[PDB]
Swiss-Prot record, chains A, B:
Task performed by this protein: Inhibits osteoclast formation. Receptor for KLRB1F. Enhances T-cell activation. Plays a role in splenocyte activation, T-cell responses and IL-2 production.
Residue ranges occupied by any C-type lectin domain in the UniProt entry: 15-119
Induction entry: Up-regulated in CD4(+) T-cells upon stimulation with CD3-ligands. Up-regulated in cultured calvarial osteoblasts by 1,25-dihydroxyvitamin D3. Constitutively expressed in cultured bone marrow cells during osteoclast formation.
Species name: Mus musculus (Mouse)
A single BP term in Gene Ontology: regulation of T cell proliferation
UniProt subcellular location: Cell membrane
Protein name as it appears in the record: C-type lectin domain family 2 member I
Length: 122, 122
């Protein structure tokens, strides 16, 4: 034996040290976040442009929730792990919950049923 | 299975112990294979359904060449490493060169411009 590295779990896809999961049906932002935590994951975070482009391409025609939320249109975007969004990429709209749509990041109320993405480290 | 290295190279995407690259611009099958070869890779192979489902999604709304070829419509499909295709999935048509389109595998002659995906092992 030599030393090897864990592959993403079955049905998860890797970019770098991250593993990502794309849901098979649409629910609200709260349900999506609960789902991700039940998978020892979080609603999806991206930390660079390579991850962000992957997430946008792979979610495709399905508008997809990710793990950014703000208390109001006046408060900073935060990840679900309660760290600040670094604001490298613009989020459109005036909503408190972020989602990917075509090649844009947008925002809306949480109640809308959308596909979602989970991410975890591995 | 387990991976030989911690991650895919930058800009490649991982499913289990394989790493994939989407061309992002279209050319003929022959140019596509030469490109993959120059990256120490090949036109995309899949060795299971998970990998195939990933490729059918990773290509987005574009078709994509893959690494299956045959001498004629009356010869068995082979991978670009010339190992036999295990025939788990049907391939439509009578062309010599395989590509993904929507959720099926089709075939055609080579000098048609299409996107491509490369694959290699991690
Ligand atoms: Cl194409």
């Amino acid at each position: 034996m030599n030393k090897t590295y864990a592959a993403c779990s079955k049905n998860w896809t890797g970019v770098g040290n991250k593993c990502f999961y794309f849901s098979g049906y649409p629910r609200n932002w709260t349900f999506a976040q609960a789902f991700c935590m039940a998978q020892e994951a979080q609603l999806a975070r991206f930390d660079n442009e390579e991850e962000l482009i992957f997430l946008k391409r792979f979610k495709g025609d399905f508008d997809s929730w990710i793990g950014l939320h703000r208390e109001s249109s006046e408060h900073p975007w935060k990840w679900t792990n309660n760290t600040e969004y670094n604001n490298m990429n613009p989020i459109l709209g005036v909503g408190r919950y972020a989602y990917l749509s075509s090649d844009r990041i947008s925002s809306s109320r949480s109640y809308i049923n959308r596909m979602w993405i989970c991410s975890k480290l591995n």
